[PDB]
PDB file of C-alpha atoms in Angstrom:
ATOM      1  CA  UNK A   3      14.044 -27.332 -11.550  1.00  0.00           C
ATOM      2  CA  UNK A   4      17.289 -28.090  -9.725  1.00  0.00           C
ATOM      3  CA  UNK A   5      18.567 -24.610  -8.904  1.00  0.00           C
ATOM      4  CA  UNK A   6      19.217 -23.382  -5.368  1.00  0.00           C
ATOM      5  CA  UNK A   7      19.530 -19.978  -3.698  1.00  0.00           C
ATOM      6  CA  UNK A   8      21.310 -19.310  -0.395  1.00  0.00           C
ATOM      7  CA  UNK A   9      23.513 -16.216  -0.693  1.00  0.00           C
ATOM      8  CA  UNK A  10      25.204 -15.307   2.597  1.00  0.00           C
ATOM      9  CA  UNK A  11      26.812 -11.896   2.359  1.00  0.00           C
ATOM     10  CA  UNK A  12      29.739 -10.609   4.433  1.00  0.00           C
ATOM     11  CA  UNK A  13      27.601  -8.065   6.281  1.00  0.00           C
ATOM     12  CA  UNK A  14      25.373 -10.867   7.609  1.00  0.00           C
ATOM     13  CA  UNK A  15      22.569 -10.430   5.078  1.00  0.00           C
ATOM     14  CA  UNK A  16      21.004 -13.518   3.495  1.00  0.00           C
ATOM     15  CA  UNK A  17      18.898 -14.075   0.389  1.00  0.00           C
ATOM     16  CA  UNK A  18      17.517 -17.612   0.309  1.00  0.00           C
ATOM     17  CA  UNK A  19      14.814 -19.776  -1.172  1.00  0.00           C
ATOM     18  CA  UNK A  20      13.600 -22.967   0.518  1.00  0.00           C
ATOM     19  CA  UNK A  21      11.581 -25.098  -1.921  1.00  0.00           C
ATOM     20  CA  UNK A  22      10.043 -27.515   0.597  1.00  0.00           C
ATOM     21  CA  UNK A  23       8.127 -24.671   2.282  1.00  0.00           C
ATOM     22  CA  UNK A  24       8.324 -22.492  -0.876  1.00  0.00           C
ATOM     23  CA  UNK A  25       9.643 -19.588   1.192  1.00  0.00           C
ATOM     24  CA  UNK A  26      11.736 -16.695  -0.168  1.00  0.00           C
ATOM     25  CA  UNK A  27      13.618 -14.810   2.564  1.00  0.00           C
ATOM     26  CA  UNK A  28      15.639 -11.590   2.424  1.00  0.00           C
ATOM     27  CA  UNK A  29      17.126 -10.745   5.819  1.00  0.00           C
ATOM     28  CA  UNK A  30      19.815  -8.646   7.471  1.00  0.00           C
ATOM     29  CA  UNK A  31      19.769  -5.720   5.031  1.00  0.00           C
ATOM     30  CA  UNK A  32      19.573  -1.996   5.754  1.00  0.00           C
ATOM     31  CA  UNK A  33      17.805  -0.800   2.585  1.00  0.00           C
ATOM     32  CA  UNK A  34      16.096  -2.164  -0.484  1.00  0.00           C
ATOM     33  CA  UNK A  35      14.989  -0.249  -3.551  1.00  0.00           C
ATOM     34  CA  UNK A  36      13.364  -1.023  -6.855  1.00  0.00           C
ATOM     35  CA  UNK A  37      13.370   1.594  -9.622  1.00  0.00           C
ATOM     36  CA  UNK A  38      11.318   0.786 -12.716  1.00  0.00           C
ATOM     37  CA  UNK A  39      10.032   2.816 -15.633  1.00  0.00           C
ATOM     38  CA  UNK A  40       6.705   0.967 -16.123  1.00  0.00           C
ATOM     39  CA  UNK A  41       5.093  -0.964 -13.272  1.00  0.00           C
ATOM     40  CA  UNK A  42       5.632  -3.002 -10.123  1.00  0.00           C
ATOM     41  CA  UNK A  43       2.996  -5.671  -9.397  1.00  0.00           C
ATOM     42  CA  UNK A  44       2.467  -8.037  -6.466  1.00  0.00           C
ATOM     43  CA  UNK A  45      -0.193 -10.774  -6.756  1.00  0.00           C
ATOM     44  CA  UNK A  46      -0.681 -12.725  -3.526  1.00  0.00           C
ATOM     45  CA  UNK A  47      -3.675 -13.211  -1.202  1.00  0.00           C
ATOM     46  CA  UNK A  48      -2.134 -11.460   1.824  1.00  0.00           C
ATOM     47  CA  UNK A  49       0.190  -8.446   1.841  1.00  0.00           C
ATOM     48  CA  UNK A  50       1.581  -7.525   5.264  1.00  0.00           C
ATOM     49  CA  UNK A  51       3.640  -4.369   5.785  1.00  0.00           C
ATOM     50  CA  UNK A  52       5.039  -3.898   9.304  1.00  0.00           C
ATOM     51  CA  UNK A  53       6.608  -0.424   9.255  1.00  0.00           C
ATOM     52  CA  UNK A  54       7.471   0.890  12.700  1.00  0.00           C
ATOM     53  CA  UNK A  55       7.867   4.503  11.460  1.00  0.00           C
ATOM     54  CA  UNK A  56       5.746   5.145   8.347  1.00  0.00           C
ATOM     55  CA  UNK A  57       4.323   3.992   5.032  1.00  0.00           C
ATOM     56  CA  UNK A  58       4.261   6.790   2.448  1.00  0.00           C
ATOM     57  CA  UNK A  59       2.352   6.470  -0.826  1.00  0.00           C
ATOM     58  CA  UNK A  60       3.700   9.502  -2.709  1.00  0.00           C
ATOM     59  CA  UNK A  61       1.460   9.407  -5.753  1.00  0.00           C
ATOM     60  CA  UNK A  62      -1.278  11.462  -7.396  1.00  0.00           C
ATOM     61  CA  UNK A  63      -3.788   8.749  -6.501  1.00  0.00           C
ATOM     62  CA  UNK A  64      -4.091   5.779  -4.183  1.00  0.00           C
ATOM     63  CA  UNK A  65      -7.027   3.549  -5.173  1.00  0.00           C
ATOM     64  CA  UNK A  66      -8.536   0.984  -2.814  1.00  0.00           C
ATOM     65  CA  UNK A  67     -10.910  -1.044  -4.952  1.00  0.00           C
ATOM     66  CA  UNK A  68     -13.266  -2.149  -2.137  1.00  0.00           C
ATOM     67  CA  UNK A  69     -13.052  -1.474   1.597  1.00  0.00           C
ATOM     68  CA  UNK A  70     -10.578   0.718   3.467  1.00  0.00           C
ATOM     69  CA  UNK A  71     -10.389   0.450   7.271  1.00  0.00           C
ATOM     70  CA  UNK A  72      -8.305   2.791   9.418  1.00  0.00           C
ATOM     71  CA  UNK A  73      -7.842   3.561  13.090  1.00  0.00           C
ATOM     72  CA  UNK A  74      -7.898   7.325  12.669  1.00  0.00           C
ATOM     73  CA  UNK A  75      -8.298   9.526   9.611  1.00  0.00           C
ATOM     74  CA  UNK A  76      -6.841  12.924   8.741  1.00  0.00           C
ATOM     75  CA  UNK A  77      -8.063  14.565   5.525  1.00  0.00           C
ATOM     76  CA  UNK A  78      -6.082  17.720   4.781  1.00  0.00           C
ATOM     77  CA  UNK A  79      -7.688  19.375   1.739  1.00  0.00           C
ATOM     78  CA  UNK A  80     -11.268  18.196   1.393  1.00  0.00           C
ATOM     79  CA  UNK A  81     -13.097  15.556  -0.509  1.00  0.00           C
ATOM     80  CA  UNK A  82     -16.253  13.849  -1.560  1.00  0.00           C
ATOM     81  CA  UNK A  83     -18.344  11.055  -0.113  1.00  0.00           C
ATOM     82  CA  UNK A  84     -21.040   9.176  -2.017  1.00  0.00           C
ATOM     83  CA  UNK A  85     -23.524   6.728  -0.545  1.00  0.00           C
ATOM     84  CA  UNK A  86     -24.754   6.283   2.994  1.00  0.00           C
ATOM     85  CA  UNK A  87     -22.333   7.776   5.539  1.00  0.00           C
ATOM     86  CA  UNK A  88     -22.998   6.667   9.112  1.00  0.00           C
ATOM     87  CA  UNK A  89     -21.291   8.337  12.033  1.00  0.00           C
ATOM     88  CA  UNK A  90     -21.589   6.649  15.422  1.00  0.00           C
ATOM     89  CA  UNK A  91     -19.930   6.432  18.774  1.00  0.00           C
ATOM     90  CA  UNK A  92     -18.946  10.020  19.467  1.00  0.00           C
ATOM     91  CA  UNK A  93     -19.561  13.560  18.266  1.00  0.00           C
ATOM     92  CA  UNK A  94     -19.574  14.720  14.654  1.00  0.00           C
ATOM     93  CA  UNK A  95     -18.722  18.420  14.629  1.00  0.00           C
ATOM     94  CA  UNK A  96     -18.355  20.954  11.842  1.00  0.00           C
ATOM     95  CA  UNK A  97     -16.584  24.267  12.407  1.00  0.00           C
ATOM     96  CA  UNK A  98     -16.943  23.814  16.141  1.00  0.00           C
ATOM     97  CA  UNK A  99     -20.677  23.035  16.155  1.00  0.00           C
ATOM     98  CA  UNK A 100     -22.083  19.563  16.822  1.00  0.00           C
ATOM     99  CA  UNK A 101     -24.304  17.946  14.196  1.00  0.00           C
TER     100      UNK A 101
ATOM    101  CA  UNK B   4      27.315 -17.858  -2.772  1.00  0.00           C
ATOM    102  CA  UNK B   5      28.511 -14.637  -1.062  1.00  0.00           C
ATOM    103  CA  UNK B   6      27.969 -11.867  -3.670  1.00  0.00           C
ATOM    104  CA  UNK B   7      25.285 -10.563  -6.004  1.00  0.00           C
ATOM    105  CA  UNK B   8      26.011  -8.058  -8.750  1.00  0.00           C
ATOM    106  CA  UNK B   9      24.449  -8.416 -12.184  1.00  0.00           C
ATOM    107  CA  UNK B  10      24.514  -5.815 -14.965  1.00  0.00           C
ATOM    108  CA  UNK B  11      22.245  -6.789 -17.824  1.00  0.00           C
ATOM    109  CA  UNK B  12      22.534  -5.703 -21.465  1.00  0.00           C
ATOM    110  CA  UNK B  13      19.521  -3.396 -21.165  1.00  0.00           C
ATOM    111  CA  UNK B  14      21.356  -1.409 -18.462  1.00  0.00           C
ATOM    112  CA  UNK B  15      19.453  -2.949 -15.573  1.00  0.00           C
ATOM    113  CA  UNK B  16      21.237  -3.801 -12.348  1.00  0.00           C
ATOM    114  CA  UNK B  17      20.353  -6.316  -9.676  1.00  0.00           C
ATOM    115  CA  UNK B  18      22.828  -6.185  -6.833  1.00  0.00           C
ATOM    116  CA  UNK B  19      23.453  -6.388  -3.144  1.00  0.00           C
ATOM    117  CA  UNK B  20      26.048  -3.958  -1.807  1.00  0.00           C
ATOM    118  CA  UNK B  21      27.317  -5.248   1.571  1.00  0.00           C
ATOM    119  CA  UNK B  22      29.288  -2.054   2.252  1.00  0.00           C
ATOM    120  CA  UNK B  23      26.021  -0.164   2.812  1.00  0.00           C
ATOM    121  CA  UNK B  24      23.767  -3.258   3.156  1.00  0.00           C
ATOM    122  CA  UNK B  25      21.722  -2.077   0.162  1.00  0.00           C
ATOM    123  CA  UNK B  26      19.679  -4.350  -2.122  1.00  0.00           C
ATOM    124  CA  UNK B  27      19.063  -2.566  -5.414  1.00  0.00           C
ATOM    125  CA  UNK B  28      17.106  -3.279  -8.554  1.00  0.00           C
ATOM    126  CA  UNK B  29      17.306  -0.465 -11.094  1.00  0.00           C
ATOM    127  CA  UNK B  30      16.986   0.271 -14.772  1.00  0.00           C
ATOM    128  CA  UNK B  31      14.085  -2.141 -15.297  1.00  0.00           C
ATOM    129  CA  UNK B  32      10.692  -1.614 -16.922  1.00  0.00           C
ATOM    130  CA  UNK B  33       8.502  -4.027 -14.922  1.00  0.00           C
ATOM    131  CA  UNK B  34       8.672  -6.213 -11.859  1.00  0.00           C
ATOM    132  CA  UNK B  35       6.159  -8.742 -10.660  1.00  0.00           C
ATOM    133  CA  UNK B  36       6.004 -11.032  -7.676  1.00  0.00           C
ATOM    134  CA  UNK B  37       3.398 -13.805  -7.539  1.00  0.00           C
ATOM    135  CA  UNK B  38       2.964 -15.845  -4.363  1.00  0.00           C
ATOM    136  CA  UNK B  39       0.214 -18.202  -3.226  1.00  0.00           C
ATOM    137  CA  UNK B  40       0.327 -17.368   0.503  1.00  0.00           C
ATOM    138  CA  UNK B  41       1.700 -14.001   1.638  1.00  0.00           C
ATOM    139  CA  UNK B  42       4.332 -11.303   1.243  1.00  0.00           C
ATOM    140  CA  UNK B  43       5.642  -9.548   4.358  1.00  0.00           C
ATOM    141  CA  UNK B  44       7.928  -6.514   4.561  1.00  0.00           C
ATOM    142  CA  UNK B  45       9.242  -5.537   8.020  1.00  0.00           C
ATOM    143  CA  UNK B  46      11.230  -2.281   8.016  1.00  0.00           C
ATOM    144  CA  UNK B  47      10.884   1.133   9.730  1.00  0.00           C
ATOM    145  CA  UNK B  48      10.216   3.191   6.592  1.00  0.00           C
ATOM    146  CA  UNK B  49       8.363   2.237   3.428  1.00  0.00           C
ATOM    147  CA  UNK B  50       8.360   4.767   0.574  1.00  0.00           C
ATOM    148  CA  UNK B  51       6.388   4.245  -2.631  1.00  0.00           C
ATOM    149  CA  UNK B  52       7.027   7.056  -5.147  1.00  0.00           C
ATOM    150  CA  UNK B  53       4.549   6.395  -7.967  1.00  0.00           C
ATOM    151  CA  UNK B  54       4.119   9.209 -10.471  1.00  0.00           C
ATOM    152  CA  UNK B  55       0.840   7.756 -11.856  1.00  0.00           C
ATOM    153  CA  UNK B  56      -0.966   5.610  -9.257  1.00  0.00           C
ATOM    154  CA  UNK B  57      -0.889   3.038  -6.488  1.00  0.00           C
ATOM    155  CA  UNK B  58      -3.768   0.532  -6.748  1.00  0.00           C
ATOM    156  CA  UNK B  59      -4.619  -1.777  -3.849  1.00  0.00           C
ATOM    157  CA  UNK B  60      -6.985  -4.202  -5.571  1.00  0.00           C
ATOM    158  CA  UNK B  61      -8.206  -6.183  -2.598  1.00  0.00           C
ATOM    159  CA  UNK B  62     -11.369  -6.781  -0.592  1.00  0.00           C
ATOM    160  CA  UNK B  63      -9.875  -4.806   2.283  1.00  0.00           C
ATOM    161  CA  UNK B  64      -7.019  -2.432   3.007  1.00  0.00           C
ATOM    162  CA  UNK B  65      -6.368  -2.095   6.754  1.00  0.00           C
ATOM    163  CA  UNK B  66      -4.319   0.775   8.222  1.00  0.00           C
ATOM    164  CA  UNK B  67      -3.720  -0.134  11.848  1.00  0.00           C
ATOM    165  CA  UNK B  68      -3.335   3.418  13.232  1.00  0.00           C
ATOM    166  CA  UNK B  69      -3.387   6.763  11.406  1.00  0.00           C
ATOM    167  CA  UNK B  70      -4.191   7.415   7.760  1.00  0.00           C
ATOM    168  CA  UNK B  71      -3.385  10.878   6.373  1.00  0.00           C
ATOM    169  CA  UNK B  72      -4.451  11.984   2.913  1.00  0.00           C
ATOM    170  CA  UNK B  73      -4.627  15.188   0.893  1.00  0.00           C
ATOM    171  CA  UNK B  74      -8.094  14.567  -0.500  1.00  0.00           C
ATOM    172  CA  UNK B  75     -10.574  11.751   0.022  1.00  0.00           C
ATOM    173  CA  UNK B  76     -13.125  10.200  -2.359  1.00  0.00           C
ATOM    174  CA  UNK B  77     -15.491   7.578  -0.948  1.00  0.00           C
ATOM    175  CA  UNK B  78     -17.550   5.972  -3.711  1.00  0.00           C
ATOM    176  CA  UNK B  79     -20.072   3.610  -2.050  1.00  0.00           C
ATOM    177  CA  UNK B  80     -20.539   4.634   1.559  1.00  0.00           C
ATOM    178  CA  UNK B  81     -18.939   4.216   4.891  1.00  0.00           C
ATOM    179  CA  UNK B  82     -18.956   4.314   8.636  1.00  0.00           C
ATOM    180  CA  UNK B  83     -17.062   6.689  10.910  1.00  0.00           C
ATOM    181  CA  UNK B  84     -16.807   5.841  14.602  1.00  0.00           C
ATOM    182  CA  UNK B  85     -15.555   8.147  17.313  1.00  0.00           C
ATOM    183  CA  UNK B  86     -15.186  11.888  17.371  1.00  0.00           C
ATOM    184  CA  UNK B  87     -14.998  13.374  13.866  1.00  0.00           C
ATOM    185  CA  UNK B  88     -13.965  17.049  13.678  1.00  0.00           C
ATOM    186  CA  UNK B  89     -14.604  18.881  10.417  1.00  0.00           C
ATOM    187  CA  UNK B  90     -13.119  22.369  10.011  1.00  0.00           C
ATOM    188  CA  UNK B  91     -11.846  24.759   7.390  1.00  0.00           C
ATOM    189  CA  UNK B  92     -14.689  24.644   4.897  1.00  0.00           C
ATOM    190  CA  UNK B  93     -18.304  23.715   4.390  1.00  0.00           C
ATOM    191  CA  UNK B  94     -20.013  20.364   4.736  1.00  0.00           C
ATOM    192  CA  UNK B  95     -22.618  19.802   2.020  1.00  0.00           C
ATOM    193  CA  UNK B  96     -25.057  16.931   1.728  1.00  0.00           C
ATOM    194  CA  UNK B  97     -27.340  16.113  -1.191  1.00  0.00           C
ATOM    195  CA  UNK B  98     -26.809  19.413  -2.954  1.00  0.00           C
ATOM    196  CA  UNK B  99     -27.050  21.817  -0.043  1.00  0.00           C
ATOM    197  CA  UNK B 100     -24.614  23.364   2.374  1.00  0.00           C
ATOM    198  CA  UNK B 101     -25.438  22.139   5.875  1.00  0.00           C
TER     199      UNK B 101
ATOM    200  CA  UNK C   5      24.885 -10.813 -16.847  1.00  0.00           C
ATOM    201  CA  UNK C   6      21.863 -13.142 -16.745  1.00  0.00           C
ATOM    202  CA  UNK C   7      19.249 -14.465 -14.279  1.00  0.00           C
ATOM    203  CA  UNK C   8      16.994 -17.548 -14.825  1.00  0.00           C
ATOM    204  CA  UNK C   9      16.505 -19.708 -11.690  1.00  0.00           C
ATOM    205  CA  UNK C  10      14.045 -22.617 -11.490  1.00  0.00           C
ATOM    206  CA  UNK C  11      13.561 -24.343  -8.179  1.00  0.00           C
ATOM    207  CA  UNK C  12      12.411 -27.922  -7.503  1.00  0.00           C
ATOM    208  CA  UNK C  13       8.943 -26.731  -6.428  1.00  0.00           C
ATOM    209  CA  UNK C  14       8.395 -24.960  -9.747  1.00  0.00           C
ATOM    210  CA  UNK C  15       9.142 -21.449  -8.459  1.00  0.00           C
ATOM    211  CA  UNK C  16      11.176 -19.121 -10.652  1.00  0.00           C
ATOM    212  CA  UNK C  17      13.244 -15.974 -10.330  1.00  0.00           C
ATOM    213  CA  UNK C  18      14.098 -14.454 -13.679  1.00  0.00           C
ATOM    214  CA  UNK C  19      15.137 -11.250 -15.380  1.00  0.00           C
ATOM    215  CA  UNK C  20      14.329 -10.749 -19.069  1.00  0.00           C
ATOM    216  CA  UNK C  21      16.390  -7.934 -20.658  1.00  0.00           C
ATOM    217  CA  UNK C  22      14.360  -7.922 -23.899  1.00  0.00           C
ATOM    218  CA  UNK C  23      11.337  -6.472 -22.063  1.00  0.00           C
ATOM    219  CA  UNK C  24      13.319  -5.378 -18.984  1.00  0.00           C
ATOM    220  CA  UNK C  25      11.060  -7.551 -16.816  1.00  0.00           C
ATOM    221  CA  UNK C  26      11.850  -9.012 -13.398  1.00  0.00           C
ATOM    222  CA  UNK C  27       9.645 -11.974 -12.417  1.00  0.00           C
ATOM    223  CA  UNK C  28       9.310 -13.953  -9.209  1.00  0.00           C
ATOM    224  CA  UNK C  29       6.586 -16.597  -9.417  1.00  0.00           C
ATOM    225  CA  UNK C  30       5.408 -19.894  -8.013  1.00  0.00           C
ATOM    226  CA  UNK C  31       6.410 -19.218  -4.413  1.00  0.00           C
ATOM    227  CA  UNK C  32       4.225 -19.516  -1.324  1.00  0.00           C
ATOM    228  CA  UNK C  33       5.717 -16.771   0.882  1.00  0.00           C
ATOM    229  CA  UNK C  34       8.192 -13.941   0.663  1.00  0.00           C
ATOM    230  CA  UNK C  35       9.572 -12.016   3.616  1.00  0.00           C
ATOM    231  CA  UNK C  36      11.893  -9.004   3.508  1.00  0.00           C
ATOM    232  CA  UNK C  37      13.376  -7.706   6.770  1.00  0.00           C
ATOM    233  CA  UNK C  38      15.375  -4.470   6.637  1.00  0.00           C
ATOM    234  CA  UNK C  39      16.630  -2.112   9.346  1.00  0.00           C
ATOM    235  CA  UNK C  40      16.290   1.179   7.393  1.00  0.00           C
ATOM    236  CA  UNK C  41      13.928   1.511   4.444  1.00  0.00           C
ATOM    237  CA  UNK C  42      12.241  -0.169   1.499  1.00  0.00           C
ATOM    238  CA  UNK C  43      11.567   2.076  -1.504  1.00  0.00           C
ATOM    239  CA  UNK C  44       9.815   1.550  -4.840  1.00  0.00           C
ATOM    240  CA  UNK C  45       9.962   4.256  -7.525  1.00  0.00           C
ATOM    241  CA  UNK C  46       7.866   3.485 -10.610  1.00  0.00           C
ATOM    242  CA  UNK C  47       4.869   5.143 -12.318  1.00  0.00           C
ATOM    243  CA  UNK C  48       2.358   2.378 -11.566  1.00  0.00           C
ATOM    244  CA  UNK C  49       2.100   0.093  -8.545  1.00  0.00           C
ATOM    245  CA  UNK C  50      -0.487  -2.691  -8.584  1.00  0.00           C
ATOM    246  CA  UNK C  51      -1.178  -4.871  -5.560  1.00  0.00           C
ATOM    247  CA  UNK C  52      -3.685  -7.638  -6.407  1.00  0.00           C
ATOM    248  CA  UNK C  53      -4.461  -9.271  -3.060  1.00  0.00           C
ATOM    249  CA  UNK C  54      -7.469 -11.572  -2.955  1.00  0.00           C
ATOM    250  CA  UNK C  55      -7.637 -11.565   0.876  1.00  0.00           C
ATOM    251  CA  UNK C  56      -6.282  -8.321   2.369  1.00  0.00           C
ATOM    252  CA  UNK C  57      -3.550  -5.677   2.399  1.00  0.00           C
ATOM    253  CA  UNK C  58      -2.486  -4.688   5.922  1.00  0.00           C
ATOM    254  CA  UNK C  59      -0.406  -1.547   6.517  1.00  0.00           C
ATOM    255  CA  UNK C  60       0.638  -2.009  10.146  1.00  0.00           C
ATOM    256  CA  UNK C  61       2.352   1.288  10.897  1.00  0.00           C
ATOM    257  CA  UNK C  62       1.848   4.377  13.061  1.00  0.00           C
ATOM    258  CA  UNK C  63       0.995   6.364   9.943  1.00  0.00           C
ATOM    259  CA  UNK C  64       0.068   5.777   6.328  1.00  0.00           C
ATOM    260  CA  UNK C  65       0.500   8.968   4.284  1.00  0.00           C
ATOM    261  CA  UNK C  66      -1.164   9.425   0.898  1.00  0.00           C
ATOM    262  CA  UNK C  67       0.339  12.624  -0.504  1.00  0.00           C
ATOM    263  CA  UNK C  68      -2.558  13.573  -2.797  1.00  0.00           C
ATOM    264  CA  UNK C  69      -5.833  11.769  -3.548  1.00  0.00           C
ATOM    265  CA  UNK C  70      -7.167   8.633  -1.839  1.00  0.00           C
ATOM    266  CA  UNK C  71     -10.107   6.878  -3.521  1.00  0.00           C
ATOM    267  CA  UNK C  72     -11.925   3.974  -1.892  1.00  0.00           C
ATOM    268  CA  UNK C  73     -15.118   1.993  -2.399  1.00  0.00           C
ATOM    269  CA  UNK C  74     -16.143   2.016   1.222  1.00  0.00           C
ATOM    270  CA  UNK C  75     -14.556   3.555   4.290  1.00  0.00           C
ATOM    271  CA  UNK C  76     -14.488   2.505   7.941  1.00  0.00           C
ATOM    272  CA  UNK C  77     -12.884   4.803  10.513  1.00  0.00           C
ATOM    273  CA  UNK C  78     -12.625   3.104  13.893  1.00  0.00           C
ATOM    274  CA  UNK C  79     -11.356   5.721  16.379  1.00  0.00           C
ATOM    275  CA  UNK C  80     -12.148   9.165  15.036  1.00  0.00           C
ATOM    276  CA  UNK C  81     -10.394  11.748  12.985  1.00  0.00           C
ATOM    277  CA  UNK C  82     -10.271  15.173  11.421  1.00  0.00           C
ATOM    278  CA  UNK C  83     -11.352  16.491   8.037  1.00  0.00           C
ATOM    279  CA  UNK C  84     -10.217  19.887   6.801  1.00  0.00           C
ATOM    280  CA  UNK C  85     -11.594  21.666   3.776  1.00  0.00           C
ATOM    281  CA  UNK C  86     -14.843  21.401   1.887  1.00  0.00           C
ATOM    282  CA  UNK C  87     -16.572  18.015   2.103  1.00  0.00           C
ATOM    283  CA  UNK C  88     -19.358  17.211  -0.381  1.00  0.00           C
ATOM    284  CA  UNK C  89     -21.657  14.290   0.414  1.00  0.00           C
ATOM    285  CA  UNK C  90     -24.163  12.986  -2.146  1.00  0.00           C
ATOM    286  CA  UNK C  91     -26.146   9.923  -3.071  1.00  0.00           C
ATOM    287  CA  UNK C  92     -27.382   8.659   0.256  1.00  0.00           C
ATOM    288  CA  UNK C  93     -28.177   9.367   3.870  1.00  0.00           C
ATOM    289  CA  UNK C  94     -25.904  11.129   6.337  1.00  0.00           C
ATOM    290  CA  UNK C  95     -26.529  10.070   9.930  1.00  0.00           C
ATOM    291  CA  UNK C  96     -24.999  10.573  13.341  1.00  0.00           C
ATOM    292  CA  UNK C  97     -25.685   8.232  16.257  1.00  0.00           C
ATOM    293  CA  UNK C  98     -28.627   6.736  14.413  1.00  0.00           C
ATOM    294  CA  UNK C  99     -30.245  10.081  13.577  1.00  0.00           C
ATOM    295  CA  UNK C 100     -30.634  10.640   9.850  1.00  0.00           C
ATOM    296  CA  UNK C 101     -29.850  14.276   9.145  1.00  0.00           C
ATOM    297  CA  UNK C 102     -32.572  16.120   7.235  1.00  0.00           C
ATOM    298  CA  UNK C 103     -30.618  16.554   4.003  1.00  0.00           C
ATOM    299  CA  UNK C 104     -33.333  15.176   1.695  1.00  0.00           C
ATOM    300  CA  UNK C 105     -37.115  14.892   1.507  1.00  0.00           C
ATOM    301  CA  UNK C 106     -38.645  13.020   4.456  1.00  0.00           C
TER     302      UNK C 106
END
């Protein structure tokens, strides 16, 4: 192809593609939104979300197909755990009593 | 260029509105992004409103600090390090209330 | 009222009104930097990431159910409500709790 993309908007935002490094950049915006009636898919080895306030997944179900790692966990309304569950490195308590 | 505003014959819109600094894609059925390296989003607030499901089909999802959920289902085991406080119900294991 | 871009490296950005499909393909990286918010509103979101998805934020909120294969909690937490464990051993600090036949 021979097309190019470097849109420089009057508010300072930029949308650009650089083919030598194959880098797509969107910068200088306040908000972005995508509204679709079917699906949104991203297929890429690494997804990195740096959100200094919050990431909200407002959905009936979030599915992690393999491992999920978190710093801390808060479960609000119960759940189920199958397989070996290993607690270490502190106290596991239930209704105020240590297990 | 210096502007972006496209209205397609299906009613979709792809635009950038510099007055409010808002990038908008609307009225579409599907979107897909395929990249060989990485996608990064850096922004205070991310909101995904998905009336059916969000699937993270990956070897590992990492939340760097807190994860809050309504309910939890762990299918194939896990490890919990630190102090874990259970309250507000019963803990059952292998068919019996503990 | 159209969008079909093909770059010298083979990447494409296109919108197809017949199927109402937006496609970005053939790129190496994308980066979006915004000062306010990024929102997606759609029934189904699929992230197919052969290495890893990192949510680097003070808080990830799942409003309803979270399902995972395996779980690792690094620095503690709280669980409220009824929790049902099945199909393996429950242990704390190396001590297998007596929840099945020894």
